[PDB]
Amino acid sequence: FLIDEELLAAIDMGSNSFHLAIARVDHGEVKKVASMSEKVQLAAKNLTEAAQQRGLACLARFVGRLGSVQPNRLRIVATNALRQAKNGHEFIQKAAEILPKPIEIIAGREEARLIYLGVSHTMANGGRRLVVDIGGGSTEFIIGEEFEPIYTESLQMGCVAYTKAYFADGEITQKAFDKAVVAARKELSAIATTYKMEGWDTVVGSSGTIKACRQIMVNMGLSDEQENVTREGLHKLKDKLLKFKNISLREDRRAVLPAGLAILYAVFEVLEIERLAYSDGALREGVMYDLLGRFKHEDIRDRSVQALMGRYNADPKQAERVVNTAQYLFDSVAKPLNLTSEDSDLLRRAAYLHEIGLAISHGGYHRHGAYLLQHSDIPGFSQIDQNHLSHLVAHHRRKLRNDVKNEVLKAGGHKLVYLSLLLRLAVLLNHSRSDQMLPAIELTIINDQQWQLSVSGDAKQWPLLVADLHDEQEQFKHWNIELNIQSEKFI
Amino acid sequence: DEELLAAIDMGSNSFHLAIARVDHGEVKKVASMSEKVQLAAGLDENKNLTEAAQQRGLACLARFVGRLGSVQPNRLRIVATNALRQAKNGHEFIQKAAEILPKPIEIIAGREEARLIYLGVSHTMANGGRRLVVDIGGGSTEFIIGEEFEPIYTESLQMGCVAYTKAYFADGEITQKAFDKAVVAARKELSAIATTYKMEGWDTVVGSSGTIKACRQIMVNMGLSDEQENVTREGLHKLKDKLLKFKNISEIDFEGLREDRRAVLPAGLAILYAVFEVLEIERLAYSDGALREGVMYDLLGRFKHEDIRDRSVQALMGRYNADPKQAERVVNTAQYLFDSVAKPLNLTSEDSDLLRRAAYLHEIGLAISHGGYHRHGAYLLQHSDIPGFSQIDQNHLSHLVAHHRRKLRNDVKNEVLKAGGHKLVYLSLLLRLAVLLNHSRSDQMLPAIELTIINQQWQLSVSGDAKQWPLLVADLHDEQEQFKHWNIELNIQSEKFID
């Protein structure tokens, strides 16, 4: 109930264990306040109830600890799990009962961005750094300097899938190692030349597979003075593992160890890495420092938005007119609709990006813009946050159909529908594009599935709005909303 | 004969034909024919072309062909605009045409159309300065701001003389009420581009169209024009006034008004009147240049190795930050393979150029996402306005980029076969090999021996030092399995590829 505006939390739902970390902002730095780690093992393609409830409780304990954090400074994150879950949406729906902020699945080149950010703020060695992270479904490779990455890539070669495909039954074979390496070499063949020419002064790893290998290196005296995993020690570990005949350290880790061991051996050989450090912070720290930017009002999502506008040459003065009108409409319905501070940001971005499909074609640009936002690698945007952004651009013009309205409701409920509607009104009013002055009062109030738009001014100027707003009533009706227009003051 | 050039424009109201010959640095017109086909009027409420309209269309093309027997099919282009865009049965009409035409019909997008209209008007009234070109057609209206022979803005609005009569003057009755509805509807259309266009501004306005042609004639005959014989703003206001003094189309008595135009004059007048008002035009001049000349000029650039299609390719590379080094390597590998199989597969230079442009563009999708970029680049190539590219051309382009990368399925092949037949299929397969051979991005000398041979079964032989290319053979064996999913046996012989 007591709320601390400098408090920042972040929940990370891993494969075998979750984690909650709380922290506060002291002079632009992130001071640790709490850390809790609960093993659920829900991930280890339909999440069984034998662990689903175990997580829903773990999350309800966490949110009770999180009672002092503003939702603006809270972030839920997950990876390589609910992706491969038939009932994943149901667990998210069950978690949405529990948590106050929707789960976020971070993957691919966004996951890579966050590992490197977290490694960069933890280990502070200067220089061109290569970060590697062998996840369960995917292995991230980043070259960056300072906190700014240069190349970010995600190779679909995780330790879980490699065992499932080459080391199934858990039987260790000479050929099964070579086969797993060969698959890994072929994956790396896409980025090796680019990454090697670019070069690195330091090599840092992350995720469990790297951690496990680092330990056995130490325990088997195969590590280095600085516990730097070395090709020599790694190659020897490879030969020692081939002596086993089956899996039967850590009990959970030995299951995927053959896959991982080959993946790192392949990485070491194809990129000619000699020495490799380990960072535990992983993506958990990335999300926290991401959260710090949002606190500092330097959100990367915002910076990406302005970058997308420049790639697609969107009209800045038209974006400005749209985003202002939308805010005014947003504020005028803020309390009744119960729209959050996040929702204002969603609309602000979408209003900036709504004309981007115009760089593809002038017909159906709203559908094109949506395809771009749905599929692009936009740094800072997660899967769900992209999907809401594209949805707002996808329905800002043309006809509305109840069939799609249901799809929108599934994606982000009535709040996404209301924003989609607010964006429709904010474009419709700037359809004339360059304008002398506000064509009318355009005052929006709400009742219940019935909105009221009041219009007042010289109707002789801007005489299309009346018809436009009446054409818009029918489309609203297709989304179960009765928009009534008061033009009695517009004449 | 071999210097002869021809173009057929299948419009909404009329089909046009133009023949020309390039004499030294000048092109001399040989023939210019027109025929009323009224394809637009043949569209049903289901936007379906009546058999009567297709037969009129097929009768006119059979005559045009009769007059084209002495022009190289490589030096002819047949384009089609709004009425075939709209038609739901347009594929039927085109496949009925394919049996009588030497060259396939190419539907072209509105903005491509506006571009070629700009060309033909440009080369007519050649006056330095920024120009607004308005073309009121049967189904759509093209607005182009440009300078010299180069458009700055192009737009294409769904308003026209035949569509608007069907909606507001179907019976033939002229009522201020119906005329205002026709003006308001066109103002709605013009609103989408108004302020943008006006901001850009112009020094001169030219009109190209039968609607504009007929208004300029009736306004000079009735003394409503000016010294330069231009459609003025005032002459329109008066022409509108005396138009409304009639109550039916049958009683229009304007001198210089063809009988076939009285039906569509009211709606054509309403659109032009709304154009003049919304864009605040004061004087418009008429040009005989049109999509017909534009196609000829577009052809002249291709004959001079100045294909705007190649300029558009380089601009897209720019916009999607495509690696120019990878692009060249693939381009060069693709041309090597192409030359080793072009005779057995009966591939022409046009095929070659399609593979060349796809090769320059196969990685534009990386600007969207590194995952599935081949699909995302197909999406851009398929849905973008790309100057110089007809719809059929873009589509084959997007197919080449779309299949170049991952797993191949037999149902996709049949979609390819419907798009561009067996040639499209081979080009997609050559592009694949070209990328695969350059997948490492090595800038090293590829295994000296890359001989592609054809026997429904292809033979790829490799010979040289295998030291620089350690996974080439395994990527080739992986490609054999994809090649069989498209019913082709790729035979890999690497016995001399060693070390």
XYZ file of C-alpha atoms in Angstrom, chain A residues 109 152-153 156 182 185-187 189-190 193-194 197 311-313 358-364 367-368 371-372 375-378 431-434 464 467-468 471, chain B residues 111 154-155 184 187-188 191-192 195-196 199 319-321 366-372 375-377 379-380 383-386 406 439-442 471 474-475 478:
78
model
C 17.471 -10.492 -31.107
C 22.992 -8.789 -32.268
C 22.008 -12.283 -33.478
C 18.283 -21.493 -33.085
C 28.091 -30.160 -37.402
C 28.815 -25.188 -37.280
C 26.170 -24.847 -40.000
C 24.181 -22.443 -37.825
C 28.237 -20.268 -40.779
C 25.723 -17.408 -41.211
C 32.555 -14.106 -41.194
C 30.754 -10.940 -40.157
C 36.114 -9.630 -39.179
C 13.517 4.567 -42.139
C 10.048 5.004 -43.549
C 10.127 8.788 -43.998
C 3.042 4.729 -46.901
C 6.689 3.938 -47.759
C 5.442 0.612 -49.142
C 2.294 1.765 -50.980
C -0.459 4.360 -50.672
C -3.130 1.744 -50.716
C -3.637 -0.275 -47.615
C -2.159 -3.032 -43.265
C 1.435 -2.630 -44.474
C 2.952 -6.042 -41.014
C 6.150 -4.019 -40.389
C 7.428 -8.549 -37.708
C 10.290 -6.041 -37.390
C 13.160 -6.354 -34.910
C 12.342 -3.232 -32.893
C -7.263 13.785 -42.486
C -6.855 17.258 -43.978
C -3.218 16.997 -42.855
C -1.818 20.556 -42.826
C -16.158 16.968 -44.715
C -19.924 13.220 -43.162
C -16.674 11.610 -42.024
C -19.419 7.354 -41.678
C 0.799 4.971 -59.402
C 2.304 10.526 -58.212
C -1.237 9.652 -57.060
C -18.867 16.311 -52.986
C -13.923 16.470 -52.971
C -13.789 13.504 -50.525
C -9.038 15.471 -49.712
C -6.551 12.614 -49.324
C -2.845 20.020 -48.899
C 0.185 17.799 -49.582
C 2.087 22.719 -50.630
C 16.217 1.908 -48.321
C 16.706 -1.537 -46.806
C 20.497 -1.248 -46.293
C 16.884 -8.163 -43.197
C 15.899 -4.522 -42.643
C 12.704 -5.859 -41.079
C 13.853 -8.887 -39.099
C 16.763 -11.293 -39.301
C 14.300 -14.207 -38.938
C 12.366 -15.120 -42.051
C 9.371 -13.796 -46.600
C 9.552 -10.207 -45.444
C 11.363 -9.223 -48.604
C 6.234 -8.919 -48.839
C 7.985 -5.663 -49.728
C 3.128 -4.872 -52.076
C 5.367 -1.860 -52.820
C 4.936 0.732 -55.521
C 8.192 0.234 -57.495
C 14.273 -22.395 -46.543
C 26.162 -18.298 -47.782
C 29.450 -17.918 -45.875
C 29.991 -14.346 -47.213
C 33.652 -15.250 -47.792
C 30.581 -27.458 -45.319
C 26.834 -30.950 -46.820
C 24.862 -27.809 -47.734
C 20.806 -30.618 -47.898
